[PDB]
Design a protein around this ligand. Structure first.
Ligand SMILES: O=P(O)(O)OC[C@H]1O[C@](O)(COP(=O)(O)O)[C@@H](O)[C@@H]1O
Ligand SMILES: O=C([O-])C(=O)[O-]
Ligand SMILES: O=C([O-])C(=O)[O-]
Ligand SMILES: O=C([O-])C(=O)[O-]
Ligand SMILES: [Mg+2]
Lengths: 502, 501, 506, 500
């Protein structure tokens, strides 16, 4: 702590993944190009908003912008596509027939909440439609109703037959399709609804890399999501979003069933006391690091940058601390979706994460993740931990890993080497999904499968050498670690070589 | 991994809360509620307001504080802090015509003038500022930042007594906003004529501490120390680190100072914003190791100026600052001018409490005790003995009798979990004790007993009564009591392990 | 640890007084008043009387001589060193008779020669190289032809060639000196001996009458064995410390329950080294010492530590290493048997143990040992325990010359000793038994106050503290300017220590 | 927590060095020595002629090569030469009277340099072979005889004689060693006899030299120069047995291939109570540097006359291994004793127990931490292999090596798993015994045409060896270390492979 040098510059290699929510402000092809250059690694599409056609056009735009860099495979960056589900939630309608329109609420003003489907696209400062039909039976005379991540509070004054009359307890902007939270109250909502099924099936068709599953409360919820994705979506990674008291207390069984976790602080910070979020966050990140599964810190990380070109000091702190905690990915929501400075938001995340990674003392973290990690017979596991240990020993410029499914690179990443992990694959999905794991730099090889297997290995290794040289991870005289197998196919990585850069 | 969420924290909150006073929190009624909510130190910001204004503020603060004096057991001392203006650069007033704030669009040209004719006629074309020698210290290509670093300008043409700039980052420009010049060596005095006037006022008004703005070196601290003079020699100097040079020369500043404030507002503009966390954690750690108060400040709950609930980044920022090892946390605009000042204080009490319960206290003490050098000082030896004993018997408190505070400070250095109840007759000592994590000051107003042994146990029993009333411990519980062998400061040598009467 | 292992310096002299207790067995070689005086000067803390040999008259005269030598230094209480008396029981053992009617006489057994083991009681004081008598009458049922019988801690191995009804004929498989009343071990064989024998009852009764400070209970196999010694000693011997000797497989296997019932432990290697495989003793020793350290109960390392010094004026390199490593393991006391009992160089043996132990103590990284014993120390409600930990931590902080403890029963001083301070613990007591028993605890320097109790209790406390201060200055623990820790209580009685003061030396 | 009811593994890591003498010189006995676990045969050149030692080496090799018919089970046995050095020794006791003379405490004793008394020593008069003794000693100086058991103090100092008083008495025999603590003995570091003996060692193809009384780096360089290019591959193990040797340890270790803690002379030259400090210091520093350290002398001294050791000796052997010693040694136990085989067997049993007591991960954590960041690829591969061996509870680390170097680099990080070192160099196989945990296996199969298959052949050979010795079975996982090309210095490949 005391020997932290501020006048010491960090490397160009950023290890933490940046996830960006794509909406009205960042949807265009030209913006998305600059998003990738700024350091976007994953595009998140929020299915609480917009239509299937809307999201399909966005996915197309993301891919168009991504593939404009495809001509140079050495410098090409894979960008993942993520589907964020609705889940068992209560949401508002469209303001003035638009997904963009907002109305200003005054403190003390009257607001009627209707269940009438005709007002679902005609919401304003006087009337607001909600999609929860059983709402009048779960609220009391004086109950508190929160809207848009708790932004606006509403006290029940009148409880009618098909409506609720409330008073605005605090002012602020109300937009379209905003989340409604009822702390303590019991919601009969299913884990996977009919809309969820259709959205999940749509993701399979659109060829998504991962699903961010909203409001996961238990292990059986994760199994339901996986069953809906079926055999077609068996390789689609499921990231369980923990955003309520139920998901926190049953986190262990959820983590076990999921391919990864997201700390969804927006909803979580109203579902549980705001002063307890940091505890849950640090608990979840630690357990994910221990289990070797991806964890995302999300929501309101640079909230003030929606309206402003520079973050608050608390926001600088937040991003940095999330990385220091051990988060694999950091996330931008409204900051890229609807804000005035989406590029600045991404750029700020690049800079803070890069600084935070230089602050992490890697040896102590590895030594702990080492003795905590159990004894296994798995050859790939032993080769991974042997390579990470060797990387610290010879101050390697990289750890080159050849991988078809990603698994080998994931096993190296869980021991948190300082050296960047260059994951060479021919599988495009594997290259996109690699961004979920801290310190993996995925590179897609499109060279034809070579006649002799030994020469196919050497070519892929040489490809990584060229990538590292061009990006600046290493130069001619440098020492690197190469991980390969003894035969083609997944699950055969058993070889570690200490080689000079050609 | 082992961190528990559904397990609520304990009664006592260790980290001090500093609140900036202004229009939103100036009345006696509001200040009473601030103290109820948890305010320990009231900060007076001398960048704004006359001496009359601040004298009234101190008057109000003391009225609210002394309304609880009827019960010395439950009485909570409130310190008064003076935050100096320092070598500040500010803009002029926006012209009467037009709007309250002028829009500065990206790519546009802006003229910076020093001509007093435009000092109350600022707009999107012409901007006045009060730093006379700006042209001498900036060059073509230099960056100029306005209004908490939200506006950015680059110098295109350097004139004789003017500057032609290009707007880089846009926004709304209001009246009298702060200006920063990173990289440039500003030649404004460390302690100006106004600063001298204000520091003297602080002495006369009997303030407890000074927050000295823009301390760049050790000699800056000495100047402040000299101005406070002999009459104000007991006033603690907290040096604000908020520029590049303050970071480079931190070690000599900390040595000269009584404590440090991580003033992240200006700091986050003078150096890159992505580097502030490094500086914050470096300074807190070094202060903890030195046994000196450290305050984390600025924008901790910004959105709570307008919103009754903080952002998730803000919730994290307050907690991480406590986990880092900060003795105090601060609110500025959240309490000075915001719509929800009491909610801001309450949120800091809540977060701080949770973070303290999260701290692995035994490991922290182990790390600090190992780094603490060997000394023949009896009080130091007694202090470490006390903290060690408090972890062994899960004591409800460490009772410390102190005149100047030093004995209680020495115990606080080793960061025990048990609350340190510092019994004192000195009113200033009880106020200044809030700068130190874990110290709960209690002011004994009882007459001094003729026999010294009976006087001690009177003050010890006073601590037993405070601890029972505030929920620190019960009759069955066991506590640690720190006393001395003779009257006067510098004689604490005795540690006793006694049950609660 | 390896970083600190490399920094060990032989040119760095030990400047601190010796903490580890030295226990000597008293026999023919050290019985006289003249020799016992020199032994106390050389560093003897505890006299051990082995009741497997000699009679009650023999040991009573030995105790008398120990007390005569000890009290010859009593004129000056400042320099006076308390000397404890320890009774070592027979236990469920098998022993030989007297060689040629003498407890000192020896015979040379030669490899290959035949030897007859008889049960006939006419030979019990007439053993030689042809005939040997044992007290275990049920030996013919537990032994078969081909079985091996070990004599005197496995020194002599014998093989059974012919088995009779009341006699065994054996062959000497290896030569060596056979003495009187030596231990007989049959590993694996199921012996049916009681925990407390008829002879043990008489000896323990003798032990109470003679006012001994501690009992070294031989061949303790289980927790009910310790409870049985505790019951036999009764209310009369309730203050007598029971040190259970671990000497066999069952003793090691049931160590936890034994330690819990006992006041302390002795790692009795002589018999243990033959009852279990010799190559496994070091594990037993290290396991038991560590558990005793962590439990805060005294542990003794015993037997063959300087074995060659029985015949030679200097130890082997192995013996030099053995003492050192015993101290580094965490043994409160080290012991001499034959080296002091029958050897030609009893004084040189004690002196050598003083030298090695003092060197090993200087090598102990007290910063690390205290760190571990404190982290693993459980949460307490006892104020005496908390004051003790506070005092030890304060002593490392101000590099004290000593921790001064006023104690009645010793408990307060013992509670300080378990956290292993570097500073010597000057335990001031008016209780003579407390002063003697304190030698079982590492780092405690027991001082007996002879002064009459002052009317004012506060002035009586100050007199005892100043008395400790006089001892510390005289023995060279500290000078005038130095800083010490003083532990006292708030009221008269036992179990009231709660006050720690950091005071300068007058 | 340590448990005696927990059985240790088959693999014993600490090498056993046995001094050969009249009690163990025969081919028949040496065969038993090897089976009981002798790894290195030590030849003490303080005694015997070149003719004598040549026959000893001949016997040791005959006994070693009797197992050569099965390469899978063949155990390499090293030959060590232990120099006389700057020794001081007494003369012969006179023919008349008893074979040994009793020296009594307080009695007067005269020390002479007159060659007429060199075989007429008695209780009144004694001769010794150090001609310049009077020049380096003063009145009051202490002189120790026969392993420090006899102590004399100078009372009168002449030109070529001494009058002493006996402090510690005892029985004095013939040609007994003399020590002069606190004296600057000016005898050559490498004498003319020493040169002859070292040249002889090169001729007889010895594996290592135990150089007596090394005081400084220049002494080591002198020994290195005598061995020359002809014997450059011979390892020099410096014996530390005086005060100057300890004081100048760092330069001695740097110059030498390894260290012996020669406790016999050390415990006389420095106070006996300080020997354990010097031992633990020197072992730690050797562990830190990755160089072999031998603990020697009196480890099981009573086993010269007794079939079972003392309890002090038991712990001594164990604590040597727990300290981190690579090799443990027997002198008189195997050379002249009544129970040489029992002494070897006992060291095998204690060392195996002590190795099971070591917390290997904690030791490896400290060894890796104190090791510098290097560019050396072999160094990095070794550290990765040891790490991987802890993670998958490997049955072994197989290392292909020519000079031993690659296996040595693994051995210094102290893995739990045995290091099977495959080599074709027979000298490498013998010298590998100096390093804790290395099990050298000599492949004698002809070099296969295809190099990739030649590597696989040696790897498969190690698999068969581990299977036969019971280190692992078919289902088990092992670590394999190989290089990218033939020749030394190219080890860079770690494989985790199942047993065939
Ligand atoms: O922390 P400080 O300033 O040294 O005060 C602690 C002092 O308080 C005492 O307990 C009592 O002193 P007073 O009589 O002056 O209040 C002294 O023993 C001790 O020196
Ligand atoms: O859904 C989310 O991302 C949240 O609630 O923070
Ligand atoms: O002045 C301050 O407190 C700042 O700039 O943060
Ligand atoms: O009884 C003993 O002390 C022994 O056997 O070692
Ligand atoms: Mg400022």
């Amino acid at each position: 702590m005391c020997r932290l040098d501020i006048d010491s510059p960090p490397i160009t290699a950023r290890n933490t993944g940046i996830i960006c929510t794509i909406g009205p402000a960042s949807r265009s092809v030209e913006t998305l190009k600059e998003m990738i250059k700024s350091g976007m690694n994953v595009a998140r599409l929020n299915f609480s908003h917009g239509t299937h056609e809307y999201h399909a056009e966005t996915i197309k735009n993301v891919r168009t912008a991504t593939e404009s860099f495809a001509s140079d495979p050495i410098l090409y960056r894979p960008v993942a596509v993520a589907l964020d589900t609705k889940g068992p939630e209560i949401r508002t309608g469209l303001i003035k027939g638009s997904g963009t329109a907002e109305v200003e609420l005054k403190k003390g003003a009257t607001l009627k909440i209707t269940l009438d489907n005709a007002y679902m696209e005609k919401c304003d400062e006087n009337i607001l439609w909600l999609d929860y039909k059983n709402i009048c039976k779960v609220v009391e005379v004086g109950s508190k109703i929160y809207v848009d991540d708790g932004l606006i509070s509403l006290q029940v004054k009148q409880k009618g037959a098909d409506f609720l009359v409330t008073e605005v307890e605090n002012g602020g902007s109300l937009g379209s399709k905003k989340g409604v939270n009822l702390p303590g109250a019991a919601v009969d909502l299913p884990a996977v609804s009919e809309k969820d099924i259709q959205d999940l099936k749509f993701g399979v068709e659109q060829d998504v890399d991962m699903v961010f599953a909203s409001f996961i409360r238990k292990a059986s919820d994760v199994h339901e999501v996986r069953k809906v994705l079926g055999e077609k979506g068996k390789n689609i990674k499921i990231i369980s979003k923990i955003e309520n008291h139920e998901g926190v207390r049953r986190f262990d069984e959820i983590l076990e069933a999921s391919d990864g976790i997201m700390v969804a602080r927006g909803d979580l910070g109203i579902e549980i006391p705001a002063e307890k979020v940091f505890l849950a966050q640090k608990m979840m990140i630690g357990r994910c690091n221990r289990a070797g599964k991806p964890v995302i810190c999300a929501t309101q990380m640079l909230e003030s940058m929606i309206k402003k070109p520079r973050p608050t000091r608390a926001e600088g702190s937040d991003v940095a601390n999330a990385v220091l905690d051990g988060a694999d990915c950091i996330m931008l929501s409204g900051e890229t979706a609807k804000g005035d400075y989406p590029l600045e938001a991404v750029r700020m995340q690049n800079l803070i994460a890069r600084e935070a990674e230089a602050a992490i003392y890697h040896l102590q973290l590895f030594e702990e993740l080492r003795r905590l990690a159990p004894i296994t017979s798995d050859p790939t596991e032993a080769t991974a931990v042997g390579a990470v240990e060797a990387s610290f020993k010879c101050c390697s410029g990289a750890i080159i890993v050849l991988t078809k499914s990603g698994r080998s690179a994931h096993q190296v990443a869980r021991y948190r080497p300082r050296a960047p992990i260059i994951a060479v694959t021919r599988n495009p999905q594997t290259a996109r999904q690699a961004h979920l794991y801290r310190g993996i730099f995925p590179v897609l090889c499109k060279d034809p499968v070579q006649e002799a297997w030994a020469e196919d290995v050497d070519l892929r290794v040489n490809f990584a050498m060229n990538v590292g040289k061009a990006r600046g991870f290493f130069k001619k005289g440098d020492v690197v670690i190469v991980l390969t197998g003894w035969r083609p196919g997944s699950g055969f990585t058993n070889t570690m070589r200490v080689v000079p850069v050609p």
